Scaffold this active site. Structure first.
Site, PDB file in Angstrom:
ATOM      1  N   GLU A 124      46.209  25.623  54.947  1.00  0.00           N
ATOM      2  CA  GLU A 124      45.468  26.691  54.285  1.00  0.00           C
ATOM      3  C   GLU A 124      44.152  26.940  55.015  1.00  0.00           C
ATOM      4  O   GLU A 124      43.377  26.008  55.238  1.00  0.00           O
ATOM      5  CB  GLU A 124      45.209  26.349  52.816  1.00  0.00           C
ATOM      6  N   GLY A 265      37.555  19.492  49.402  1.00  0.00           N
ATOM      7  CA  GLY A 265      37.881  18.512  48.385  1.00  0.00           C
ATOM      8  C   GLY A 265      39.348  18.138  48.365  1.00  0.00           C
ATOM      9  O   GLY A 265      39.694  16.953  48.363  1.00  0.00           O
ATOM     10  N   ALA A 266      40.222  19.140  48.348  1.00  0.00           N
ATOM     11  CA  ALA A 266      41.659  18.903  48.357  1.00  0.00           C
ATOM     12  C   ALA A 266      42.362  20.201  48.727  1.00  0.00           C
ATOM     13  O   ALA A 266      41.733  21.246  48.910  1.00  0.00           O
ATOM     14  CB  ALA A 266      42.148  18.377  47.005  1.00  0.00           C
ATOM     15  N   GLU A 268      46.350  22.074  47.753  1.00  0.00           N
ATOM     16  CA  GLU A 268      47.613  21.958  47.046  1.00  0.00           C
ATOM     17  C   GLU A 268      48.772  22.338  47.954  1.00  0.00           C
ATOM     18  O   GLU A 268      48.646  23.179  48.849  1.00  0.00           O
ATOM     19  CB  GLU A 268      47.624  22.841  45.794  1.00  0.00           C
ATOM     20  N   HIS A 301      42.747  20.229  39.065  1.00  0.00           N
ATOM     21  CA  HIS A 301      42.775  21.481  39.810  1.00  0.00           C
ATOM     22  C   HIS A 301      44.047  21.607  40.640  1.00  0.00           C
ATOM     23  O   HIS A 301      44.766  22.607  40.548  1.00  0.00           O
ATOM     24  CB  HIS A 301      41.539  21.563  40.704  1.00  0.00           C
ATOM     25  N   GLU A 302      44.344  20.598  41.460  1.00  0.00           N
ATOM     26  CA  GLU A 302      45.503  20.714  42.337  1.00  0.00           C
ATOM     27  C   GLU A 302      46.806  20.708  41.544  1.00  0.00           C
ATOM     28  O   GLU A 302      47.800  21.289  41.990  1.00  0.00           O
ATOM     29  CB  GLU A 302      45.495  19.595  43.381  1.00  0.00           C
ATOM     30  N   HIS A 305      47.738  24.233  40.074  1.00  0.00           N
ATOM     31  CA  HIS A 305      48.353  25.125  41.045  1.00  0.00           C
ATOM     32  C   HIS A 305      49.872  25.069  41.030  1.00  0.00           C
ATOM     33  O   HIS A 305      50.514  26.029  41.470  1.00  0.00           O
ATOM     34  CB  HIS A 305      47.865  24.785  42.451  1.00  0.00           C
ATOM     35  N   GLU A 324      42.467  30.996  43.088  1.00  0.00           N
ATOM     36  CA  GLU A 324      41.383  30.022  43.090  1.00  0.00           C
ATOM     37  C   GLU A 324      40.505  30.134  41.849  1.00  0.00           C
ATOM     38  O   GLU A 324      40.218  29.123  41.200  1.00  0.00           O
ATOM     39  CB  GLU A 324      40.546  30.174  44.363  1.00  0.00           C
TER      40      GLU A 324
HETATM   41 ZN    ZN Z   1      42.705  25.568  44.635  1.00  0.00          ZN
END
Ligand code: ZN
Length: 889
Positions: A124, A265-266, A268, A301-302, A305, A324
């Site tokens: 991404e 941070g991360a 998905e 959060h992840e 998704h 997002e």
């Molecule tokens: Zn996200």
């Protein structure tokens, strides 16, 4: 630099139906073979077949198993591979290629790269083109069959999307695993991980279909004992989506992987979420309190998704806020429900009104759906994420839980299995809006301006109360300053959650009420108001706006003490501070400008100080809320209200205000610090990683806040408490003892003590670097030099670089030194970092975002450094575009 425009979207002239990948990882190279089963779309006009491919070393490319020839049949410029249309078939064909990449030396952490002894992918947004050739855009949906091979000793764990359908040995100590993922997906959700991973495992049973789901959390062997909380947060996340949204996990297994080197941070992927280690690993002994709310938010959060990404993906990258902003919104609902503390919502507003408001008033200002970009990596902003979340949250405020959940269901059902836009989400919410109002003529067409219009709206209030009529009127006015994105700003659909407080007893006077402001100004009238009320405006921070309540400090104190909504009390306290700050600032400023030998300063409101003491002494008041009221507003929130900010004068202003309040309340501060010790530092569950008390951590926050206030004030014998604090088992405590010891001779003693406690844990040492970096030391520049030579060295780990330099940039007095030494410092760091990681280099430009808001001399200093960085011959496209936009070029 090519500029992509949102209005220029058109579907591809090609189709990619099936991707068959063979990724062969070796010690010094990785060979990528890919067969693309492609077709001609109805939008084809006989154009050249152009793939994206960045940094690929071609061994061969083909079409229908016939090798193509460079120069005559195709060209490749390390960025685009152009196959001339006379060699492109007119029906279903197969494109194949074999390229060589080098994740071992991929220090930009995009595409396929090596982090310590783990090889992971980050696709991404445009990262997949760094692995193989592809039409790297989200609307190209394809099926994926991926085979990965590597040395079995170094990479025994192979992970990718879909089901692992084959595992086989290979001569030479190698092995392979094959993953088939039948569901169509965009290439940015492709992921592969290889390494000597250890794991914790659990089985989750879904709510409605009773399906067993295997949960795995991975890390390197050294930190396997820090996986428990992440596993717990995953269970919480799955239960929340089931309880709140009624959504079950679609797959039979979910993997979480922690890596040490990560830009954000991360990220998905379908069934395989990859995290920065600092947002997945924690233990009570080796992590500060902050990590536990952070892991909870990021893991949730992840996960949020998964369901939406499995059905509705982005049409193009201008819709980034659709996936997002909505996911951050779902993330915030989740954390508010899990923490059960009012400070969770307060912390989100605090970051928005400081970091995001600064960005929205800077030359980098953009709407949550931008109109153009040249580098997509520069628009993963707090505007797209956090203002986007506030715009998604307003749908819930306007509709209420029932009709919002209905509009959410419509959005999925109407767009399932297809790509969508922000308008598609607004349409689904509009259908729920018509159902709530019971009026099929109603619409949310004005609401689309939240996606298109830049800048922060200003909302001002005037009031009128007719005592004889028992009639109360709220006059509301809205306004957005013109910027470079719109010359004329239109009025927005602003929901204003309001209450009315009786000042005589603190009682509510009306039921729940959300004013719907849809005009430049409106007048809202209320009858049967027995007494003149105090208005409680924008409860829960119901709109992403500047609030000008036009209330007296007496009225704000009454809200602070007796209002029911945590934000309005928090905002009322903020408003009182700002009025004091602006007054003392101008007094210091004119004394400095006029070179006064003597001058006066206006004291802090005594009734305001009495109210803080009232709340601090309340045993039934919230400890987290108490820590907010004893802290002045963030510097980056203050700067939005001062032109040509003199950072030295602001530091003198904050200094005077803190000492004024401390001169009255430091005895209360000390008494609370001592009485809170028992519950805040309770060790009953120190060795149970899955027991997390957010109330208790807020008590620690309050103790660490008060200890900082008492240390700055040189409270009698407070060094004794600082030394004792150094021996606490909680890293939040003994790292606080380091920062507060900066005002004493024992600083470097605690520096060495805490370093010895932090040096053997990768994440803990990075927290130690942050604590040293933000230490209020007069010799901070020499201390930073010591960090560079002794700890940081030539580390390319973004967590290391960010920990050393970014907290120092918030030292108001020292970073903004009038010599510009602080600007030259960070400028050297960015240029050094830009040589191997442009994205992290852009992140390190954050202090420059306020450059045009400081005094004229500091504007010159910052602008000179930014122009120095722009003249670097080897500057990246990411850094160049960012600095060009920031300096208005
Ligand atoms: Zn996200």
């Amino acid at each position: 630099p090519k500029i992509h425009y949102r209005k220029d979207y058109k579907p591809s002239g090609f189709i990619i139906n099936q991707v068959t990948l063979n990724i062969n990882i070796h010690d010094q190279e990785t060979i990528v073979r890919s067969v693309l089963d492609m077709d001609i779309s109805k939008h084809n006009v006989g154009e050249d077949l152009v793939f994206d491919g960045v940094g690929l070393k071609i061994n061969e490319i083909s079409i229908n198993n016939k090798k193509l020839v460079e120069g005559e049949e195709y060209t490749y410029d390390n960025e685009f591979l152009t196959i001339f249309s006379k060699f492109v078939p007119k029906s279903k064909f197969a494109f194949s290629s074999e390229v060589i990449i080098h994740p071992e030396t991929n220090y930009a952490l995009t595409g396929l790269y090596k982090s310590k002894n783990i090889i992971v992918s980050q696709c991404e947004a445009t990262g997949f083109r760094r692995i193989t050739f592809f039409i790297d855009r989200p609307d190209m949906m394809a099926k994926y069959d991926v085979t990965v091979t590597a040395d079995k000793e170094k990479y025994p764990v192979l992970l990718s999307n879909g089901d692992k359908v084959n595992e086989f040995e290979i001569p030479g100590g190698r092995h392979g695993a094959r993953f088939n993922d039948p569901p169509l997906k965009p290439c940015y959700l492709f992921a592969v991980v290889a390494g000597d991973l250890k794991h914790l495992s659990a089985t989750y049973i879904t709510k409605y279909t009773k399906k067993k789901v295997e949960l795995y959390v991975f890390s390197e062997e050294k930190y396997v004992s820090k996986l428990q909380w992440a596993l717990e947060c995953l269970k919480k996340s799955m239960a929340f989506d089931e309880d709140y949204f009624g959504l079950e996990y679609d797959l039979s297994r979910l993997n979480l992987v922690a890596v040490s080197d990560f830009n954000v941070g991360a990220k998905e992927n379908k069934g395989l979420n990859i995290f920065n280690a600092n947002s997945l690993l924690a233990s009570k002994k080796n992590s500060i309190d902050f990590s536990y709310a952070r892991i909870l938010t990021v893991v949730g959060h992840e996960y949020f998704h998964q369901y939406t990404g499995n059905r509705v993906t982005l049409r193009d990258w201008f819709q980034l806020t659709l996936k997002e902003g909505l996911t951050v919104h779902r993330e915030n609902l989740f954390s508010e429900e899990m923490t059960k503390t009012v400070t969770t919502r307060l912390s989100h507003v605090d970051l928005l009104r400081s970091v995001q408001f600064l960005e929205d008033s800077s030359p980098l200002s953009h709407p949550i759906r931008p109109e153009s970009y040249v580098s997509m990596e520069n628009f993963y902003t707090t505007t797209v994420y956090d203002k986007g979340s506030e715009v998604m949250r307003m749908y819930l405020t306007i509709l209420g839980e029932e009709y919002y959940k209905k509009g959410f269901d419509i959005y999925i059902k109407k767009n399932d299995g297809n790509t969508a836009t922000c308008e598609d989400f607004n349409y689904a919410m509009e259908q729920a809006y018509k159902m709530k109002k019971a009026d099929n003529s109603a619409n949310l067409n004005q609401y689309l301006l939240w996606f298109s219009q830049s800048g922060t709206p200003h909302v001002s209030f005037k009031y009128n109360y007719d005592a004889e009529k028992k009639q109360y009127s709220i006059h509301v006015n809205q306004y957005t300053k013109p910027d470079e994105n719109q010359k004329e700003k239109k009025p927005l659909f602003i929901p204003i959650s309001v209450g009315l407080i009786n000042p005589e007893n603190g009682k509510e006077m009306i039921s729940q009420t959300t004013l719907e402001l849809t005009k430049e100004s409106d007048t809202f009238v209320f009858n049967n108001i027995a007494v003149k009320p105090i208005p409680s405006l924008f409860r829960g921070f119901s709109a992403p706006v500047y609030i000008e309540d036009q209330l007296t400090d007496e009225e704000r104190i009454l809200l602070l003490k007796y209002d029911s909504d945590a934000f309005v009390r928090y905002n009322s306290c903020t408003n009182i501070y700002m009025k004091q700050i602006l007054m003392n600032y101008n007094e210091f400023l004119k004394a400095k400008n006029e070179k006064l030998e003597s001058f006066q300063l206006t004291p802090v409101n005594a009734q305001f100080i009495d109210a803080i003491k009232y709340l601090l002494e309340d045993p039934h008041a919230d400890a987290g809320f108490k820590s907010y009221i004893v802290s002045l507003p963030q510097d980056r929130y203050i700067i939005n209200f001062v032109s040509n900010l003199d950072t030295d004068v602001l530091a003198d202003t904050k200094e005077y205000i803190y000492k004024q309040i401390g001169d009255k309340l430091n005895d209360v501060y000390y008494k609370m610090f001592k009485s809170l010790e028992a519950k805040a530092d309770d060790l009953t569950y120190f060795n149970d990683e899955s027991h997390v008390d957010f109330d208790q951590m807020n008590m620690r926050t309050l103790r660490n806040t008060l200890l900082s206030l008492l240390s700055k004030a040189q409270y009698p014998n407070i060094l004794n408490e600082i030394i004792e604090h150094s021996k606490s088992p909680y890293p939040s405590n003994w790292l606080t003892s380091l920062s507060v010891s900066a005002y004493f001779d024992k600083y470097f003693e605690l520096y060495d003590k805490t370093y010895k406690l932090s040096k053997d844990d990768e994440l803990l040492l990075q927290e130690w670097l942050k604590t040293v970096s933000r230490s209020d030391r007069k010799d901070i520049y020499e201390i930073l030099k010591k960090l560079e030579n002794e700890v940081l060295k030539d580390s390319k780990n973004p967590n290391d670089i960010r920990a050393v330099y970014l907290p120092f940039t918030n030292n108001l007095r020292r970073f903004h030194d009038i010599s510009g030494k602080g600007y030259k410092l960070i400028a050297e760091v960015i240029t050094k970092t830009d040589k191997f990681n442009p994205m992290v280099a852009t992140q390190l430009c954050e202090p420059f975002k306020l450059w045009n808001k400081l005094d004229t001399k500091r504007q010159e200093l910052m602008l000179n450094e930014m122009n120095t960085m722009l003249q670097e011959p080897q500057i990246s496209n990411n850094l160049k575009e960012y600095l060009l936009r920031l300096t208005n070029k």
